[PDB]
Amino acid sequence: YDIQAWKKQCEELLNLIFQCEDSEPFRQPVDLLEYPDYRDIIDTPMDFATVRETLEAGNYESPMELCKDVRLIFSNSKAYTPSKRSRIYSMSLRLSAFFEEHISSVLSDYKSALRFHKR
Numbered sequence: 001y002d003i004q005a006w007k008k009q010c011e012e013l014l015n016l017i018f019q020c021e022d023s024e025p026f027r028q029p030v031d032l033l034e035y036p037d038y039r040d041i042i043d044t045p046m047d048f049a050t051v052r053e054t055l056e057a058g059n060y061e062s063p064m065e066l067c068k069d070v071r072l073i074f075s076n077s078k079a080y081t082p083s084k085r086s087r088i089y090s091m092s093l094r095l096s097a098f099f100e101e102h103i104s105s106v107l108s109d110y111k112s113a114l115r116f117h118k119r
C-alpha cells in the first residue's frame with residue numbers, strides 16, 4: 001500500500017517508452033515554425049521529455065496527472081493525423097496501447113494505496 005511507489009514505476013515506464021522506436025516523434029516538443037499545422041490545431045503541446053521533466057521536478061501529485069499528459073500526446077497526434085496513412089499514426093496507436101497496458105497496474109496500486117490510507 002505504498003502511496004509513493006507510482007513515481008519510480010512511472011520513471012521506469014518512461015525509460016521503456018524512450019527506448020521504443022515508436023516514441024521517436026514524441027520525445028521532444030514540436031518546432032512550431034517547422035510544423036505550423038500542429039501549432040494551429042494543438043491547444044496544449046505535450047511530449048515525453050516534458051512529461052519526464054515534470055515528474056522529475058516533483059510537479060505531478062499522482063500518476064493520474066502523468067497519465068493525463070501522456071494521453072494528451074496521443075490525442076494531439078490523432079488531431080494532427082487526418083488519415084491512417086502516415087508513420088506518426090501507426091507509431092502513436094502502438095505506443096498508446098503499450099502505455100495503457102503498463103500504466104493500468106500503476107494506477108490500480110496507487111488508488112488502492114490511497115483507499116487503504118483513508119480506511
Ligand SMILES: O=C1Cc2ccc(Br)cc2N1
Nearest residue numbers: 025030035038076077080
Ligand atoms: O518531429 C516531429 C514532427 C511532428 C509533427 C507532428 C507531431 Br503530432 C509529432 C511530430 N514529431
